[model samples]
Each structure stands twice: as structure tokens, then as C-alpha cells.
Target chain A: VTLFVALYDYNATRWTDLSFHKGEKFQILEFGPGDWWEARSLTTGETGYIPSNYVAPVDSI
Target chain B: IIGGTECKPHSRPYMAYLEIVTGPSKFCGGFLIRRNFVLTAAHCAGRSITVTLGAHNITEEEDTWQKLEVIKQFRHPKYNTSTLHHDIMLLKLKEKASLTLAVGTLPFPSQFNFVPPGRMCRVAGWGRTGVLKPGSDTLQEVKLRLMDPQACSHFRDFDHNLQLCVGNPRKTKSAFKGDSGGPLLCAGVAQGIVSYGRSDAKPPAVFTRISHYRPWINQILQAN
Candidate 1:
């Protein structure tokens, strides 16, 4: 799976969702048609929903 | 793209197969408009994109090809997904393209020669040839005839001023979803970029006219 770096420090708007500070990276678990995508944080290893626009894709070196 | 014949290896030196490292594991086609720039359709824009130029077989490593990460993307401000207006975009690569027999950039829009309809022009890319199939590993080329503006009136949202209507529906050859950002080569210049097409992968696909965006292109290149 490709990793995406957080674009901003998102405070969880809802309890069920996740939050990540800017510079944090995650691997997308599911990219559906919805605006909210499912992801697992790279550092913490927790899976939750995050806004699709809140993160930018990271290209492999 | 769909319904295309095999291409002469590296015949289209300006061809680029974009790798989207995220979002459903998709690919998009682009072309070298400049040493550091690639022109494509705005709808192909994603959170991030990496460009592979001078490629024929994407899965195989080639000494002639250069794969570079995109530094940034410039999508037209007026671009709208719902209306499909201003379906154009530009990508800036981290490094400039080099000079090689298989590494080259197409001429700018100003250098375009007007080729009227009925003449054959081609588009090359690695998009799928049919629905439910993966894109070709080797680059594919398909010849198409430029269609008259009147031919596009059937679609209410097709803007003739900023787009070109092209395809040879009779032959069932056209760009598919994977080739969305590739160029429409006519008279040795990219007159258009591949835009929307039918989900059925049928012919007569719309292309974003490159000539009309010369000013926009020049401004970005000069600024960067």
C-alpha cells in the first residue's frame, strides 16, 4: 500500500474518526467514492477514518 | 488506450505514463510539453503524481526512460468535475528531461499546424484496450480522425472553444479511462489532451484543446 503524509493537523471532528498532526503519514486501507477515506496511521498503527483531502500521497524514492 | 495497435518502441518520445502511488492503483497518460513540465487533463489530478517519460514497456526497466516525481501540479482554476469545463492541467517534474533519441519533448502549442478533419492523427498511451482488462504493458497507438465542431453539439456540456471532438467511431478506436491525460497528436503537434470518454470505452471521445491554453501554459513555464 502507498503512504500518504498528513496535509494538516486535523482534530477529530467525531469520536469514531481519527486525528493526525501535520507531518504524520499513513497507509490508505480503503479509498472509496466518499470524501472520508479509511486509513491506518503509520506511527501509531491505528485504523480509522480521515478526510481524503486531509492527506497527500507520498511517492516512493 | 483502447482499440490501438502496437507502437514502434519509443516512437513517441514525448509520451509519459503517470504512476499514481495512491487511490485505487490507477495510471494516467501525459506528455512532455517542456523539459520540466507535462501537460494533461485536469481530471487526472490526484493528491500526488509521479511521471515516467521515454517509456514503451512500463513494467520493464529501460535505460532511455526517466521516471521523476512531480514537484507540483497546476490545474486550471475554472476546472469543474461536474461540468467538465477547463479539463486541462500541467505537472512540473522534479528534474528536467534530458536529450536522447528516446527522450524528447513535443513542440509547444504555438508550433501546432492546423490539420483539418479526415486526416489521420494518433494518440499513444498504456491504457486498457477493453473494459474489465488491465492496461497494456507496452505503449499502444491508435489513429483517429478529427471531428467537426458540429459533431459535438450532441453533448450539451462539450465546449468547442476549449476542446476538440475527435474519434473514428467506425473503427471503434478511442482513449479509455487510463489515457485520460494523454495528447492528441495532429500534424506532428499535440493539438489536444485526452479528456472524457464513454464508460463503454466507445469512440468519439472528447479532448481538451491545447492551442487555446497557450497563454496559460507560457505563464506557468515562465514563472517556474
Candidate 2:
């Protein structure tokens, strides 16, 4: 089964496990060397998943 | 005497019901046809049921409790409680009323008449406000105009008969929770019975089309 997370702030590159919107879906990222993510949560700086679908060059913002 | 609503004295009369609850599960609200025979949703009453009538107000202040002598309680045989279909009932008061007929009894429409979309109808009730929400304290009414089921871009798989959706998501005033089993009245006629509704939607109210159940209504009323 392919697991997914919420794609929040499409332009902001933020991910969350909680599903607020009924139709929000995103891919999961693997943990490895050279793999990096920036925390976008205002209060908590926990790095969330990075979906393969949204990792396109157009979303480099 | 608190009755339903009066546009003007001697004008077309309308009726409303209040679900008065007592004990753990006792609930009831019936419309006064005259001084007797309160018209209400059949599901609300069964054996050992009690009805109060002849009061303009349901608060029991203006009107005293005249115990209803129910000779018969009629429910549409096809009425499915789970799906909330064919929901119409009549409370036959044991005695003929001696009170003045200020409020007239409405005749159920014989055929399903479509209110050309974009027309407005009035609905009054003390139904719930939203899903699991509290019921209104006093009887309140809101007006909702009919919309082209085609114009409604909100509902999924729409059915104009089982579901007569009113109001637009942007500027609509349709009925909400706790308004079920009431009446969606228009031009001195009882159009639909406030049946089911959705809390989160564009046009958020649903009612049973009165015309769809004409045979069931006539079947019961004609059976002396």
C-alpha cells in the first residue's frame, strides 16, 4: 500500500500527517543521505514527508 | 391564542409544530387543524401518545392542555422511517372542534406541481440548527426560493422529487437541522414536508415532495 501525507501550502513546501481537507493527497519520501527537507511549521520545526509527485522542478519555490 | 402564521386575518392560514420533549425520550409536535385532530409526523407518535391542541402558542400558556382524544393516528403505509420517505400523518381528535376556524386546514395537492425554479416558498419550524445542534427556542421561519436543480452545482446526483433543493450557496436561506417534519408552504398550499437535509452543502435543506405521496394521503383520509 502506498502511504501519503497532506500537501499543505502548495507553494510553501510544508507537509503534515493530519488530513484536514478531504481530498488532499501527496507521496512519501525516503530517508537517506543527501535527502534533505526544511521545516515549515511555525511552532514546531519537525521535518515532514516530501512526496515524489510534488518534488518537480516547478515546485522549487 | 398563538396559531401558526397569518398573512392577514381571513387570509390563507399556515401551521407549524414544536417538538416538546419530556422524560428521557418523549417528544411530540403536531399542527392544529382546528381545536382537535393535530396533524403531525406519524413517526413521532405511536401507542400511548398524547396531543395538545387549540392553542396559538405551544408554550401551554395561552392555551390550556385539552387532552387529545385520538380516535385514530394515520401514517402512510409506505413510510420508511430509516430513509425518511412518504412521511405524512394525521391525528384524528375524538370530538369535532367547536372553536373558530381562524386557521384553515390545507388540502394536500393532488398532483406533483413543480414550482418553476427560482420561485420562493416559506418554511416555519423549530427544527435543529445543524447536525447534532440544539433546537430553536421559539418557532422561527425562513424563506427559501426554489433553484434549478441544474443551476445547483453543489449536490451530487440530484433528484428533484426525493430532494427539492432550495437556496444558493452564496445567498440562500434554506432550512437547516431540526426543521424536519414541518411544512414548506407556498400560496396557501402545503408544498413539501420538511424531511431530511445536509449540514455541509450549498443548498442545505431537503424535504419530501407532497405530491409524490398523494395516493398514500388520500388513501388514509378517505378511509372513514
Candidate 3:
């Protein structure tokens, strides 16, 4: 499984109404070449599209 | 004594002294941006923390000074400790601070409006008065001129968008240790947060551009 990255939601409607807090980890299902990515919440498994700047690849455990 | 002068009472109502509970009692400066939220450098976040508000001096306990425990904290998710980029954090207090003549909050600058170069700003803290001297007991404030962000890379690994430089590159007043997370006030508005700087105080001190993070701050505040 791919590692999860932390993100801060900008728009609730755009990032989906999922409860993703700042610094919370989320698993990435796929990444777009542009500015969006498909990810699932590590805590709740809720999946949605989030902006690329909202999350970055984990550097360490 | 070198470049800092004693601060006047109630002059900086939003100033906050962060008591970071690390091993041997560490401290950092911060500022109140909202009733329950403190803005500071991300690197200052510790296990247990408390904030002193309405404090004009750190030595004697003033009647206006109120110490409150930190209930929660939010460090920028993109913060890079190694690179020292996105060096900003927010602390949620257990209760809202009682606003008075001595305690209040600073307003964030409007979108796209930045503290331009040559603007005179004020930075205050209990940090060292001299390069090798001990930290000051009384709050010290120094006037610094904002510098071109494009030239910041010459001093250190800097991001023009996330960080801005202050003080004179040749020789001028600058922030020392113990000043981290302190506010850089321009025309009585919070414009920047003390991030990092050189030890010898030669290079201009770096501050996180608050204007660039307004949306993020708003998002977090709105959600919480």
C-alpha cells in the first residue's frame, strides 16, 4: 500500500464533505498530472479528490 | 542594548510569550491573531505549551499578564524542518483571552497586500540584546526595514513566496534567538512571523509572510 500524506482542506464542497483535519494522514489511490489527486482517509477510508498542494509525499515514518 | 530598546506597556497588545515545555524550559515568542488562537513559528511547537499574554516584561509578573495553557496546535502540514520553509503554526488556547487595553489581537493584512520593501516594521521579544549576551528580562523592540525578498536567497536557502527578509543586509538591527514566532508589525497590523536568522546578526532576519497564509489560516479557523 502507498503511504498516506497529510493535508488541509481548503473547500469542503470541492474536497468533499469528508472530515479531514490539517496534519491528518490520507492514503493516495492515484495522482493526477495536474493539481488534483485521488485519496482516502486513513482514519475513515473516505475517498475523494484533493489538490496536489494540499498534500505532499511523506518523507519519513 | 545593542539594538533593542525597552518596549512600552500596552503598545503591543497582541504580543505573546510562548513557554514551550521541552526538556529544560524552552521559550519562543508568539502573537494572538484571534481570541483563542496564537500565531507562531512551526518549529517552536512542543509537547506541552503555555502562552503568556498582555506581558510587557518577562521578569516581573505584571497585573495584566495572563498565562493560559495550550489545548491544541496546528503546524502547517507542508512545513519542512530541514529547509525551514512554511515555518508557521497556530495554537488554540483552552479559553479565549480577556480583551482589554493590555490584551487584544492583530488583524491580518488583506489579500495580495504585502509589507513592501523599505517599510519600517517593529519586532519585539525577550531575546538577546547583543550577539553573545543573555536574553533580556524586559521585552525589547527594534525597528527594522523590510528588504527585497528576491535577495533573501543570498543570505540563506529562502523561498521568495513563503519567506521575507527584514533588517539591513550590510548592518542593522535584527532578531536573535528567543525571538522566533514573534510578530513583525507594520502600521499596527500583523504582517510577518519571526522565522529564523543568522547568529552573528549580519544577514537580514527571515520572517514567514503572513499574507501568503491567510487562506490557510482562515480555512483552519473556519473548520475549528
Candidate 4:
């Protein structure tokens, strides 16, 4: 399992379908180059897109 | 802000303007696929939106423009803004738009993979003329050179299968914010939709290849 933390709070409604709040940690499922990655939230179990630049990678939480 | 020219009135009638209704008001370009459906970039979708059709000049009142309430929005279920892939959305209008002198639908590409690198295409939008500058009130159009798949993917690990990288990175001509969701026309055929671009507008811009989504587009239009 991989872990990632939000870099900053992003509350824009445009991304509500893949919503994630700031300071939240997400479990990485798939990784890709360019601007995006796939992750599941630790608490909500909601899986969706997360900006690569918005999160920093970590070994574990 | 790259080199572009204002479009003549009544040209490119299939062009659409997708406007976010709440929070901060902003503009994104779109195009008509069917009389009642508008196709655009999924990232441009919102809970509430109003679409303007047949608009030549957004700043000046034009009789050709028809504003419609968005009754529903259908963003691709798998759209991922982080990856900026599968960046397509279809908006269903409350009422079917009537075809007018300044409004129409763009023809979809007859063949998949019809466009190759080195081919010429056109993109039109109301996005900024330059970074940190105001958006153009009049729609602007620019000629772009579609890049070789290898060249387009070299800069960013772009999913070559799903995205079409177009533009001359060497030149400043590129689509920026407010230009998202606009059409990328090749031979006057709907080839792609503006998806994302680099912060500096270099490395070319990525577009959602329409040919890849023909089945999905057909399914939705047939059932909806």
C-alpha cells in the first residue's frame, strides 16, 4: 500500500465528483505520469483522481 | 495570447460557450454534437451551468446568441482531472436548440485515427490572450500543427492513445484557461476537445480525442 498527503486544501466544486479535502491522506492504487494519479481515501474509501502535484509521496502513514 | 484572429460573424456556428453559474463566473468553450446536447471538457462541468449558443461577441448583445438552461450534465464516469484523461462531458439542454444562421452542429470525424502529426488544425476559444491578462470578449481562432504522437508524449508522459497533443510549443500560440472544452477542428471535422495545457503554454496542449469516444457519444445521444 502507498500513502499520500494533500499538499493544500482544494475545495473547488468543479472536482466534487472526485472530491478530497486538504490534509487528507490517500492510499495509492495506481500511478501515472503527467498530472494525475489514482487513489483511495483512508477514511472514506472513495477512490478517484488526485493531482500528482497536489500530493507528496510517503512510505507509510 | 498567442497569435490569433477574431472570427468573422456566423462562422463556426457549432461553437458553444459553457459558463459556470455559481461561485466565480467563468467561460469555457464547447461545441454542439446534437441539437440538444453540447460536448465539452469534463473538468469544465459544474453543478450549475448555462450555455450560450450562436454567440459571435460575448461582450456585445447579439441576436444570434441563445442562452439555455442546463437541465443535466453527463461527465464521463471515469474522468480524472489529476491525470487529465478521458476529459469529456456532455450537457443536456432543457429545450432543444433550434438551428439558426448562427447555430449548428459540428460533424464528427468519419474515421478514427484520421489525423496524423504534421497535419493542420484549428482551435477557437475565448480564453486569455496572455497569462494574467483578461480573456478576449470576441472569439479568437488559431491554426495549430498537430504534433507527432512521439513528440507530444515525450514532454509529458501523456496517454498517447487517449490524448492528442497539438500546437507549436516553440510559439506562444496555445489554449489557456477559459479555452478549456473548446473544439479542435481538422478539415472542419470535430477532432478533439481542449483538455489541458502547460502552465507556460509550452510543450504543446493536450486535447480529448473525439474519435476514441464515438461509441460512448453515440450511446448517450441515442438513449438520451
Native contact fraction of candidate 3? 0.00
TM-score of chain B of each: 0.93, 0.71, 0.95, 0.95
Tens digits of per-residue lDDT for model 3 on B162-216? Answer: 7878887766578877888999888888888988776566658789999999999
Q: Supply DockQ values for each candidate.
A: 0.04, 0.01, 0.02, 0.12
Model 4 spans with C-alpha error above 4 angstroms: A1-61, B111-113, B154-156
Model 2 CAPRI rating: incorrect
lDDT of 4 by residue, B1-224 (tens): 25788999779899998877433455688999888999998877655889999987888878898889889898887876556679899999998889988999998765455577788889999888886678898899989889877766643458777889888777778777678899999987899999876555564888888988888888888889
lDDT of 2 by residue, A1-61 (tens): 1234344434321111111332343322232111322112223322232323333222322
Clashing pairs in 3: none
Residue-level lDDT of model 2, residues B90-201, one tens digit each, is 7677765444343445566666565566667877665444434555545566677776667533444455765566655565455654455567767766777765444442
TM-score of chain A of each: 0.88, 0.23, 0.68, 0.73
* Per-model fnat list: 0.00, 0.00, 0.00, 0.15
* Worst-scoring 10-residue span by lDDT in model 3 chain B: B19-28
Pairs that collide in candidate 2 are B2-B56, B2-B57, B3-B56, B127-B178, B127-B179, B128-B177, B128-B178
How well does model 3 score by local distance difference test?
0.77
Arranged by lDDT, best first: 1, 4, 3, 2
Candidate 1 RMSD to the correct structure: 9.4
Ranking by DockQ: 4, 1, 3, 2
Q: What is the C-alpha lDDT of each candidate?
A: 0.78, 0.48, 0.77, 0.78
* Most DockQ-accurate candidate: 4
C-alpha-based local distance difference test score of model 1: 0.78
Q: For each candidate, C-alpha RMSD in Å?
A: 9.4, 15.3, 11.7, 7.0
